[PDB]
């Protein structure tokens, strides 16, 4: 209708907000929140020549129908019953893959430490996000076969009956406390080798200290220490980017 | 406290009864069906002749300390949270051992392809198959390091990273491999002692299997089933044998 805000040279209409409005429980400021950041988004795309192939479309497409153990007819259907057109489907998806695209681009400008003092140092910063539980009680399921637990933890539907494992700080190694406590109550944990077969356990409840512990968790302080200094990295860059470009509210 | 149940001259008393209630928290009769099976397992181990002696308690023990490259005073140190009581769990669990591979021998079981080849018929989603894996591959000219790394699971120390796939791999070790989740560990195998494998992907290619893809799993699980079922029917048969007084 009129436009309402440019950022950069890009134009935002009061159309734009208006549909924007819509497509979310949200509203400008809001909806004008994300239509300035998509703006932003698609002026680096431009600058950083970030883009998606017809081809690197179909293969991305693929890729979600094999990790979702479903085929392009099966999807194609699917979405039919939804009444969504598989065009709009492409269309949505593209948009995700470059905004992807982006931002892996943009991360690969940042300079990573992956240093154990570096983590350790994180560690002890953050020991909040790694609290293990003291005491877990929950559903052991075994087996010779390890594709029948893994038809569990899919199919929630089994045989035979589960024992119930109250598992002290004594009665079992800490990694799979520090596992299962991770686990939400009720869902299950990955196949594990245990020393009789394998293993699949199904949380009850878990209580305990909440205790941590360095060394017992050095593999995943890293992740997450790299995982945050992407993060933060990102959004530095666009920060500093929210500052030098020009934002223009017009007399619409 | 007293004496509720004699099973072949073993008895069961109210507070082994009423404390198994506790550590597994089921009802009386349950809990006695928990004792009454033990029970049944000593007076076979007495008529099969099963039993551990010293020399071979203490064998058994240096050999899992060596694989774990640990030792006896590391080990009794670690336990402090009982050595003895620990001695004598793992002697029984060798007595249970020992008592069901005698007992599973027994069974005249099928170990051809031709029975695993019914069987896979009637569970064909219990097995996998995968095209295309990538495994973290630890190789050691010896199979203690190798297993300790599984059981432990502590780096010790750098893995080969591979892309399997059917035109690089015996298509038994895809099989093999294709089973085991992601995140956990092959057995340890030989070519020759030894390899181990340790899953990071799949899916990477699925497919249903056939029969020859995965007959060495196929194969195992058909002759695990035969064996559990065996020793299954076994005890629920002795259970109406044994002899067995209550009290009253």
Known sequence: NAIAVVVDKEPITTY??????????????????VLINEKMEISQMKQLGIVVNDLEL??????????????????KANLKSKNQSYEQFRTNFKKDLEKRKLYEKIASMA???????????????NKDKFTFYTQINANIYLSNNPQTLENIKNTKKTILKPQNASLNTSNADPRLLGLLS???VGSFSPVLNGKNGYELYEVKSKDGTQTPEYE????????????????????????????KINIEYLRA
């Open 182 to 184: 991770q686990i939400p």
């Open 16 to 33: 734009d907000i208006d549909q924007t409005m819509k497509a979310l429980k949200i509203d400008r400021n809001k909806a004008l929140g």
């Open 111 to 125: 300079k990573t430490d992956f240093s154990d003092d570096g983590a350790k140092k994180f560690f002890e910063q």
């Open 58 to 75: 179909d293969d991305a497409i693929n890729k979600m129908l094999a990790q979702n153990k479903t085929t392009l007819n099966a999807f």
């Open 216 to 243: 017992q968790v050095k593999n995943e302080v890293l992740n997450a220490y790299v995982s945050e200094q992407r993060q933060n990295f990102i959004q530095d860059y666009f920060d500093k980017l929210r500052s």
